[PDB]
């Protein structure tokens, strides 16, 4: 309804709430799509998109989201968030859950992970450990 009213900022608040609740609810793909709409805070949107993709065992789409943000948005290219996302993708491709944990602790040390990121990161770790088992 806001998007019809051309209220971009409010509509963006709304789709942030929708995407966060969807991602917490296991609808990772749909949340990633809403994050694509929100992208089209930007650094944060890129991170979250990749994270949902990683919760959907979708490492390649996370890599593309990273590449998209790096090429299109210079502030995201050099950011800590892009570095965190590449490190997570590398861990996921490596099947290395402790490396994922280490990267999480580093990023927590420099940029506090809110409860949402912690939940999604735990889901990603669990998917790695399940593949290991």
């Amino acid at each position: 309804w806001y998007a019809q009213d051309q209220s971009v900022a409010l509509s963006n608040k709304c789709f942030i709430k929708c995407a966060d609740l969807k991602a917490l609810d296991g609808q990772y793909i749909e949340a990633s799509d809403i994050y694509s709409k929100l992208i089209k805070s930007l650094k944060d949107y890129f991170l979250k998109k990749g994270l949902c993709q990683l919760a959907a065992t979708d490492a390649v789409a996370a890599a593309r989201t990273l590449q998209e943000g790096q090429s299109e948005d210079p502030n995201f290219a050099d950011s800590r968030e892009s570095n965190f996302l590449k490190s997570l993708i590398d861990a996921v491709n490596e099947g290395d859950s402790e490396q994922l944990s280490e990267h999480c602790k580093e990023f927590d040390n420099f940029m506090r992970l809110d409860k949402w990121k912690i939940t999604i990161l735990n889901k990603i770790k669990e998917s790695i450990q399940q593949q290991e088992d």
């Binding site: 490596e94 099947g95 290395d96 402790e98 290991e132």
Partner: protein, 109 residues
């Protein structure tokens, strides 16, 4: 597509532990892996640089075709060079000269 070079004369596969924290240093026999690989993937078109997952001894391995040598059925002496490009293709057979090498992990011996 290939016309005559439709079989594999020699196929080299780099074998890695998918789970490298679980690694084992013992000497691996290429032939056992060859038997099970052919058993699992007989009569299939293969090209180099192909990522695959393969189970062996409860240890799962990523198998990456390094290079493919394509020969026709009838060459007593393999005259086709060991090619690395994706263009070369051949169907796996028991007589293929299978060579195995250090995986993406570099841990397998």
């Amino acid at each position: 597509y290939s016309g005559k070079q439709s079989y594999l004369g020699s196929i080299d596969i780099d074998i890695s532990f998918r789970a490298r924290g679980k690694a084992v240093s013992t000497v691996f026999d290429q032939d056992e892996l060859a038997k099970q690989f052919v058993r699992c993937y007989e009569s299939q078109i293969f090209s180099p640089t192909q990522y695959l997952i393969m189970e062996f001894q409860g240890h799962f391995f990523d198998l990456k075709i390094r290079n493919v040598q394509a020969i026709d059925l009838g060459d007593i002496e393999p005259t086709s060079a060991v090619a690395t490009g994706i263009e070369t293709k051949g169907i796996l057979t028991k007589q293929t000269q299978i060579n195995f090498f250090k995986g993406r992990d570099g841990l397998v011996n």
